Amino acid sequence: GAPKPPQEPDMNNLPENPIPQHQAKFVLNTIKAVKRNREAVPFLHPVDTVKLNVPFYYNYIPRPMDLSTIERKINLKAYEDVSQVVDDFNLMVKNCKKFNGEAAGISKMATNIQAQFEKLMVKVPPKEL
Ligand SMILES: O=C1c2ccccc2Sc2cc(-c3noc(-c4cnccn4)n3)ccc2N1C1CC1
Ligand SMILES: O=C1c2ccccc2Sc2cc(-c3noc(-c4cnccn4)n3)ccc2N1C1CC1
Ligand code: NI
Ligand code: NI
């Protein structure tokens, strides 16, 4: 099957102007809140295709994503905008639905934590200032 993509973030391609700290603190706390959701447990760590016996996972999913990667990218200043945090969360969810199917129980878990994430993000402070 397709090989495992490199871990994010690319430490040689970090942005010159990352998310401002007041937004970075908020999205970090937002991800940590989602990580405490019981529905988030299977999303805490990258898919391990050996443990799960899916040799063709990366053929479906060329850009895997998980909550720990989002947290790491926030901490390592890899994001330029909070829209990219939203994008990565949506990518994690879309990956799950693409590989497992929309009707799978794991995809309902993904939808549930996406709904929590979206509700929490209502209160993100604006970028300017
Ligand atoms: O995409 C998948 C995926 C990919 C291939 C096959 C199934 C799944 S579903 C899935 C399950 C897990 C998992 N972690 O632990 C256990 C477990 C299961 N029973 C007993 C003990 N532990 N399952 C982690 C990630 C995960 N995800 C990612 C969308 C989350
Ligand atoms: O038989 C199966 C089985 C049944 C159906 C589909 C796949 C598998 S393979 C399999 C994986 C898991 C699992 N535990 O943690 C994770 C994980 C994966 N990535 C990230 C984080 N965590 N996967 C547990 C039990 C397990 N087993 C039992 C033989 C062990
Ligand atoms: Ni292979
Ligand atoms: Ni704004």
Author numbering: 192 to 320
Question: From the publication, what sentences describe this entry?
Answer:
BET proteins are chromatin-associated factors that regulate transcription and chromatin remodelling. BET proteins bind chromatin through their two BDs (BD1 and BD2), which specifically recognize histones acetylated on lysine residues. The BDs from C. albicans Bdf1 (CaBdf1) share 31–46% sequence identity with human BET BDs and 58–66% identity with those from ScBdf1 and hence are likely to bind multi-acetylated H3 and H4 tails. In conclusion, Bdf1 BDs are required for the viability and virulence of C. albicans and can be selectively targeted by small-molecule inhibitors without compromising human BET BD function.
In particular, several compounds possessing a dibenzothiazepinone scaffold exhibited low-micromolar IC50 values towards CaBdf1 BD1 and no or only weak inhibition of Brd4 BD1 at the highest concentration (20 μM) tested. One such inhibitor was compound 1. ITC measurements showed that 1 binds CaBdf1 BD1 with a Kd of 5 μM, consistent with the IC50 value (4.3 μM) determined by HTRF, whereas no or only modest binding and inhibition were detected for Brd4 BD1 and CaBdf1 BD2. Furthermore, a BROMOscan screen from DiscoverX revealed that compound 1 showed no significant activity against 32 representative human (BET and non-BET) BDs; indeed, an ITC experiment confirmed that the two human BDs (SMARCA2 and SMARCA4) with the strongest BROMOscan response did not detectably bind compound 1. To understand the molecular basis of selectivity we solved the crystal structure of CaBdf1 BD1 bound to 1. Compound 1 mimics the acetyllysine ligand by interacting with the conserved Tyr248 and Asn291 residues, forming direct and water-mediated hydrogen bonds via the thiazepinone carbonyl group. The dibenzothiazepinone ring system engages hydrophobic residues from the Val-Pro-Phe (VPF) shelf (Pro233), helix B (Phe290) and the ZZ′ loop (Val238, Leu243 and Val245), while the cyclopropyl group interacts with the VPF shelf (Pro233 and Phe234), helix B (Cys287) and the gatekeeper residue on helix C (Ile297). In contrast, the oxadiazole and pyrazine groups point away from the pocket, adopting different orientations in the four complexes present in the crystal's asymmetric unit. Superimposing the ligand-bound structure with that of Brd4 BD1 results in a steric overlap between the larger Brd4 side chains at signature positions 1 and 3 (Trp81 and Leu94) and the oxadiazole and distal benzene groups of compound 1, explaining why 1 fails to inhibit the human BD. Steric hindrance from the corresponding residues in CaBdf1 BD2 (Phe409 and Ile422) also account for this domain's insensitivity to compound 1.
